[PDB]
């Protein structure tokens, strides 16, 4: 070989040293969202019982017999709120991923003639404790977890039945 080959080798080494990386932030955000999913999954044992024994969905945390919203905290979750049978979990604000900072996800159920279906996805809201339909959050504050930061099994739409 000669000097040209060595220079080309050095250039190739420099090229390989600085290379683009895939979007690994989305996977980390997906991993961190699972904590809020698990924390919200633990409050459905006290909502279904109230609905079954009273005929209407719980209005607040007091009616469902769960702890205070600000007291349901984890490593990346700061609050879990129950409102008209809808469970909303909010992320933290300081030591989290830059993409799921102060964002919310929902967990609601719809009653069928022989089962009670459960849905997971973006935030939704109800209107009355005796209603059977849900609508979008429309918070106008950009507090919705993006689709890319959710599992493929947790992307239900507000009109799903």
């Amino acid at each position, epitope marked *: 070989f000669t000097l040209i080959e060595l220079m080309i080798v050095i250039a190739i080494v420099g090229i390989l040293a600085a290379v683009a990386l895939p979007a690994y932030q989305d996977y980390t955000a997906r991993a961190q969202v699972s904590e809020a999913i698990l924390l919200a999954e633990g409050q459905k044992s006290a909502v279904t019982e109230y609905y079954l024994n009273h005929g209407e969905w719980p209005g607040d*945390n007091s009616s469902a017999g769960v702890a205070t919203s600000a007291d349901i905290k984890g490593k990346y979750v700061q609050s879990v709120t129950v*409102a008209n049978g809808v469970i909303t979990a909010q992320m933290a604000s300081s030591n989290v991923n830059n993409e799921i900072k102060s964002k919310k996800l929902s967990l609601w159920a719809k009653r069928q003639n022989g089962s009670v279906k459960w849905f997971c996805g973006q935030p939704v809201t109800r209107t009355t404790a005796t209603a059977t339909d849900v609508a979008a959050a429309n918070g106008k504050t950009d507090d919705k977890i993006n689709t890319k930061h959710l599992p493929s099994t947790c992307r239900d739409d507000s009109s799903a039945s």
Partner: nanobody
Amino acid sequence: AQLQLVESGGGLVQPGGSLRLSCASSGFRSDYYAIVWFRQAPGKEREGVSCISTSGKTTIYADSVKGRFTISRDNAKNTVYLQMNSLKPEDTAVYYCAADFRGSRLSDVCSYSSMDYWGKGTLATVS
């Protein structure tokens, strides 16, 4: 878990007058409660008048005070106001202020049952 409520603003006014009642609550999480106003006339029993939700976007009234009473909440001063207009001689009673615990600051449930704390009461007579 020792919230206390103080009621002030009562007085004596002629019929057709206006009065402003204020309830001040201090201690721990005072923004997690729903303030409900009661009224007890001599001879009769206690009854509900107005209620306000924790979120502040749900206010209910009584059939006998519809269109004449207004209730507002200001969390900055930790006070809840109840304004009366077009007073009637049949409104002579003692007003009380009490709170109900709701584990959320974004609730919309108002109820007149199962109250926790209470207040001393304020005197309001019209003649």
